[PDB]
Each structure stands twice: as C-alpha cells, then as structure tokens.
Write a protein that binds this ligand. Structure first.
Ligand SMILES: [Cu+2]
Length: 105
C-alpha cells in the first residue's frame, strides 16, 4: 500500500497529532483540494460541519483495495500516513461532487 491508517475510525479534532498536515472539511469542500506532502507525512482531515464526510480513494490508488474512510461526524478527524510518492485522488462517498488530491513527492 501507499498509505497506512493510524486509526480505522475517526477521532476528535483535539487529538490531532503533532506534525500532522491538516485538511479542513468546511463549506462543503476539502478546503485544501490539492495538498503536496513528503513521504512519511501524516495527513489529517477534520470535519467542521454537521453533515458527515469521509475520504474515499478508489481501488488501485492507495493500494489494491479502495480505501473508503470512515464517516467523520462534526469535529471528528481521520488520518492517513503516506509511504510512497504518487498522486492520490479522492472524493467524499455520500457527496461525490467533493473532490481532492494528495501529491506525495
Ligand atoms: Cu461529504
């Protein structure tokens, strides 16, 4: 795989790790829709809205399987630690008009 998952389920926004690269989900959008990080960085999405959101990478992007992240409730967070260079597109499962990408380089 090209990312590891610290926590399979969401955790509180206040529990964000030191050094994590935060993407806010606000105004119905990934507020940083194209993020550039280095190998080994942890990206943490934080849902700021009442509507639940996730991140969803189709099969063949982060690895063989799709990575369908857990639904984050308001003020919950979810992390992926990227371990390989590449370009990784994702969307929100219930709201597929929400699109983002992580470029690892
Ligand atoms: Cu959504």
């Amino acid at each position: 795989d090209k990312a590891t998952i610290p926590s399979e389920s969401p955790f509180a926004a206040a529990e964000v790790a030191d050094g994590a690269i935060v993407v806010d989900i606000a105004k119905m959008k990934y507020e940083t829709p194209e993020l550039h990080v280095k190998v080994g960085d942890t990206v943490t999405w934080i849902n700021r809205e009442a509507a639940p959101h996730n991140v969803h990478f189709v099969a063949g992007v982060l690895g063989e399987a799709a990575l369908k992240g857990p639904m984050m409730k308001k003020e919950q967070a979810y992390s992926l630690t990227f371990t390989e260079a590449g370009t990784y597109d994702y969307h929100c499962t219930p709201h597929p008009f929400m699109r983002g990408k992580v470029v690892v380089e």
